[PDB]
Amino acid sequence: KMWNLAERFVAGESIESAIQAVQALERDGIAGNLDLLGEFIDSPAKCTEFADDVIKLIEAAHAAGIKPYVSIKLSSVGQGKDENGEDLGLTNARRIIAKAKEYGGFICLDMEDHTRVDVTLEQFRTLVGEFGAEHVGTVLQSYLYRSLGDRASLDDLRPNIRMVKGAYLEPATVAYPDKADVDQNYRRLVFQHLKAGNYTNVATHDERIIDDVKRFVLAHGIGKDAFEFQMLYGIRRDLQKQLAAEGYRVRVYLPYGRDWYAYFSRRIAETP
Numbered sequence: 001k002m003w004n005l006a007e008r009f010v011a012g013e014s015i016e017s018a019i020q021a022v023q024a025l026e027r028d029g030i031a032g033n034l035d036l037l038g039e040f041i042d043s044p045a046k047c048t049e050f051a052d053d054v055i056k057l058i059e060a061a062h063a064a065g066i067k068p069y070v071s072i073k074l075s076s077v078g079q080g081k082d083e084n085g086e087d088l089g090l091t092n093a094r095r096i097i098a099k100a101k102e103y104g105g106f107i108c109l110d111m112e113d114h115t116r117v118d119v120t121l122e123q124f125r126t127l128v129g130e131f132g133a134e135h136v137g138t139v140l141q142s143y144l145y146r147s148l149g150d151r152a153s154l155d156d157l158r159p160n161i162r163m164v165k166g167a168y169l170e171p172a173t174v175a176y177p178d179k180a181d182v183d184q185n186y187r188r189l190v191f192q193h194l195k196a197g198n199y200t201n202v203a204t205h206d207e208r209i210i211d212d213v214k215r216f217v218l219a220h221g222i223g224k225d226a227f228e229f230q231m232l233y234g235i236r237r238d239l240q241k242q243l244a245a246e247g248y249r250v251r252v253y254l255p256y257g258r259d260w261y262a263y264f265s266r267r268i269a270e271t272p
């Protein structure tokens, strides 16, 4: 009965359970951000199957009257694999974004470990050019030394970017080892993106940072339509509700699927 526990953080194992969970968030004035979980994705066949499963999700969400908003890791759809002379991740991402876009939806390219940052930001730029900044977004992680520079380099795209602290175990040659620096850099990324007038998703459960961002938005006259807070399903549900009740946009990341063990284990690891 790991599931009796994991149900807090994972919508369920089916597309149906995910849609039901988005519908519940929506009834509470909160948007959803769907994440298909998968573990075996280590072959071009399986990466493309995964992409097809994300597309089936997008169709089901659209059928259920939900604007598709889905986050994917490009490695899961073939990033770094060549199929007939083109990168499989880019090929599959195009299929997935085109389908989301047809239904007025949006895809976020999540950011993986440091080895995939350059390719992801190159691919993101390509895809923004093909589909528009209103339909594809990405993520920057405040623990990396390179992130402030990366954010500034994307300003010409006026891009939708989610700021996160960072999820991977990265060495000190790549990521600030001091949590104080990670947190200060997080504010810097959020504030520079907001000052540039780009749509910003403030993905954090750190209430001190949440309060400071509220302060910043107030002091700078930034509208509550210009950014949103984002949280993982099941973490600080009280803040999710409170921020929605105070007029902020809140969008909750909802993982689903049969392969939930690793995701669930990371939620357990991060228990305060």
Ligand SMILES: Cc1cc2c(cc1C)N(C[C@H](O)[C@H](O)[C@H](O)COP(=O)(O)OP(=O)(O)OC[C@H]1O[C@@H](n3cnc4c(N)ncnc43)[C@H](O)[C@@H]1O)c1[nH]c(=O)[nH]c(=O)c1N2
Binding pocket: 109, 110, 111, 112, 139, 141, 164, 165, 166, 167, 168, 203, 204, 205, 206, 207, 230, 231, 232, 235, 236, 252, 253, 266, 267, 268, 269, 270, 271, 272
């Ligand atoms: C919507 C969204 C989307 C993503 C990500 C986060 C979110 C919210 N992340 C993960 C992110 O990098 C970061 O690891 C987590 O958000 C945790 O960091 P915090 O900002 O919550 O602060 P921090 O880790 O400091 O935690 C702050 C507080 O939040 C609460 N909290 C956090 N985790 C909890 C838990 N498991 N159980 C109970 N309470 C908990 C506790 O109160 C804790 O003190 C991510 N990372 C990445 O590298 N690439 C990505 O694409 C993404 N995508």
